[PDB]
Structures are given as C-alpha cells and as structure tokens.
Symmetry: D2
Subunit: 146 residues, 4 copies
C-alpha cells in the first residue's frame, strides 16, 4: 500500500512519488516509478479539482498497487483521498506548510550535494583515464584494453 | 611517422615498443588497436632477435615507420631496423639499461598502488552518485535523471 | 534574532532547537558554541515541559530571542515561549508531527550512509595526495610541498 | 649507501634526492631529505666543477650516510664520483640523455595527476563540510563538534 500521511495538497504529487520510490526500491526501475506516479498524480489531481480542494488544504492519500513484471499496476478502486480544509484545521495546515517550506530549503542542500558529486564523478573519471594512460606509456602493466 | 625505442635492454623491448606506440598514436587510435599492432610487431621483432643471437642482457634500438589508416596501425616491415649492442662489447650501456629496467619494475609497484586507489575512488564516487540521486527521489521534488 | 521551531512533537523538541540554531547562526558562530548554547536552552525547556505536564506525544512550538556577542549565543530567557498542544485536543496535528518525526529517523539512516561514504572518500583522497607527493619525491625533480 | 647508478650529470642532483627519498622512506621527514640532499648536491657540484665535468657527461654517485635522531648525516669520506665523458662513452651518454628526456615528459603527467588530486582533495573537503552541515541542520545525529 502507498500512503502519503498528512501532506499539503500543493505538494501531494511529489510526496506520492517519494513514497513510491522508497517502497518499490530494488523492485522496480526509476523510470517506471516516475511513469507510475505521474499517472496516479494525474488521476489524483482530477479528483482534487472535483473535490474543491485548495492547495492550502491538507490531504492524505492511500492506494494499493501491485508490481507485475517490474511494472507498477495501480488499483484505482483502492484509492482513498482524505481531505482536511485549512479553515477547519488551521494548525495542521500551518504545520504542513511549514513542512513544505523546510523541504524547499533542504532541496537547495541536495542540489549543492549533487553538484559536488557530479564534480567528483568527473574528477574520478579523469583520474582513472590518466592512471590508465600512465600504465600505457610508462609501464609494462596489464592494460584494461588487453 | 616513426616508432623509436631508443636504447633498451632486449629483455624489455616489447613493453618499450608498446609504450612508445601508445604515446605517439595518442588520440589517433583506440588502445585495443595499439595493443594489437604492438603485439604483432613484437612477435616479428622477437623472431629476428632470436635469429640474430641476441641475449636479453644485450641492448637494442628499434625503429620502424608505420601509418595510421582508418584508425588502424599498418606497419611498414621494410623500414624496421634493429640495432644491437652486445653486453660484452658495451658493458656500461648494458649496465645502465639493466638499471633502467629495474627502476621501472619498482615504479610499477607505485602505479599499481595508484590504480588500486583510483579504483576505490571510482567505486566510492559511483556510490555517492547513487545515494545522492536516491535522496533526490525520496526526499525532494527535484528533477530526476530518470525523467 | 529569534529562534522558532514551528510545530514539533515534544519528544523531538531538543533536536529541532539545535537544528534551527545551527541554520540561523551559520557562519556567525562555531558549531561547539551552537551545541553548547542549545544544550543549555534544551535543559531549561525540558524542565518547563516537565512542570507543564507535557507528554512526548504532545506538540509544542518554541520561540526564543537570543543575541550573538563575541561569537557566543546569549539566550534571553525572558523571551522564551512554549506553546503546547495536547494530543487529545489535537489528534491530527499530533499524528502529523509523529509522522514527521518518523520520516526524520529514516532520513538519518540515509545521512549516516552518506557520512560513511564521505569518510571513505576523505581517506582515499588523503591517500592519493600522499602517494602523488611521494611520486614527486621519488620520480621527479618537481618542487615539493616540503620545500 | 646511496647510489644513483648511471645518470647524466645535468640531472645528478634530482637523482640524488630521488634515491634518498626512496631509501629513507618512513625513517625521515621529507624536509630533512630535501635538506640533506641539498647539502650533498652542493658538495657534489663543486667537485663536478673541479673535475671538468660537463652536463653531457655521465656520472655515478655513491655515498654512505647514517640516520641519527631522524637526521641524515653524510660521510663525505665515502663519497665516490665516477665520471664518464660523452666523447669516450657516446652510447651511454646518448642513453642517459634519452632517460633524462623521458623523465621531463613523465613530469608533465605527474603534474596533471597532482592537479587532479588537488581538485579531489578540495571536493572531498567540501563534501565532508556539507555532510556535517546536514547533520547539524537536518538531524539529531552525534556531531563532530560534540
């Protein structure tokens, strides 16, 4: 079962995808997760529209699904969307907006991290290239190209 | 284009040929071709060294013109020259080449140490890249590589 | 300058205080001071939470003004506000905060994985730097760091 | 004993230092090696001058030394400088010049490597900093500053 727990509606789609990545880990290729989540979020968003849900509102989303041949097959029947109007849940709404905000800031950190890892991957590749080149030019060592 | 080993102890002619070949075809040819081309030449050279009564203590100089055609090394076997220098006639040169050969065996231990390090590094770098992407997937709305 | 936790399950107030403190004093203060200042405040807060009959299932909001003087965090205990929200009166808020707390415990496993990786990385990087310098020493006339 | 083996005179000083680094490895601090070699090479160069040795000539240098309290103490008495005039040793001289040349080229490679390792060290430090910062800002994990 996929469960978001409480989430501000504005950020329901990201939360769905995040949970989906975590629970299908190793069981499915990322592209499938992205594809499966995109579909569900399309459906969810239509229902949120029909339900008069604002982005300030808080929702909980649940849905059973199955993995068949490495493919996520949703059971749309099992989809539940609990809604919580901001005006009826002032504090919950406030807390979820706070969560959403903490997350936007954390993403700046992740992007900083990603940039570093990218640089790192590049440098690592260069080092591996240079090293192999030295093997070729300055030694009789067994080569990768052998 | 010409391949030249300069002075080299016969025992290590084949590695030297390959090393020079890698350096001068750099960018112009895929490594596998270099390995393949050198292997062929070294096969021929070794037959000639046998015929010439060359010992591994002797010192040789090898020269050979070749062309790169369609990214392939084509030797001109006609241009191949093998100058030989008998240890007994060139005791100092022979000694020096043996010293070179020895310094090179030691330097290879260093390179292997370096390679191991770079391998570990590559592994760690890949792990970090994997983990980072996973955090993007699980803790953010950031654009994913898989998108 | 004001420290604000926003909504947080009481059970994890102390970590949240420290986290917010690190973020807002960034660059202005040494980490050891942040740890020291937060430890003090959290000591006081916990006494008050005890006196207030706050359970760890309850949700609190903490606010407190402070000043940085000579790179030292000086709390203004007068400005400290502890808003409390009983689980039984705020079942959904309490549930949400417990969910947050849980997502955070899981995220920490990820951070520890990352830390381990970065540690390995630091070690490998140091080794590489050592080896490289050693090659400068042993196989080159290059200017050395020790010069 | 320190022994250079055959070396073109032009590059005797670097060869001395290199051999010294290799044989005192772990037994002595680099600064001492640099200091000790600098001294010997000063003396050697004076003798090379007195001996009418050109830089095209080939020399062999031997010298016993002792390590006392982590300090290299030369035994100048044991110093031997075999010389080989280019004109009397055409082929040896040619070979040593070739060696010297291969070494100049290899140094370009080492400098490339050093630059990479420097970048790597920098990136590694940044990563360690960022990681610790995330511990501080997004977790309750035990900190290094604790």
């Amino acid at each position: 079962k996929l469960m978001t727990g409480f989430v501000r509606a504005s950020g329901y789609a990201n939360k769905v995808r995040r949970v989906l990545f975590a629970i299908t880990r190793g069981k499915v290729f990322p592209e499938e997760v992205v594809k499966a989540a995109g579909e569900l979020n399309k459906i969810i968003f239509e229902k949120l529209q029909e339900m008069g849900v604002k982005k300030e509102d808080v929702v909980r989303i649940s849905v059973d699904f199955n993995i068949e041949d490495g493919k996520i097959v949703w059971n749309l029947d099992s989809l539940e969307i609990e809604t919580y109007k901001k005006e009826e849940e002032e504090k919950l709404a406030l807390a979820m907006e706070e969560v959403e905000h903490m997350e936007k800031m954390f993403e700046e950190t992740v992007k900083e991290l990603e940039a570093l890892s990218d640089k790192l991957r590049e440098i690592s590749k260069e080092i591996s290239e240079l090293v192999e080149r030295m093997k070729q030019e300055y030694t009789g060592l067994k080569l990768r190209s052998e």
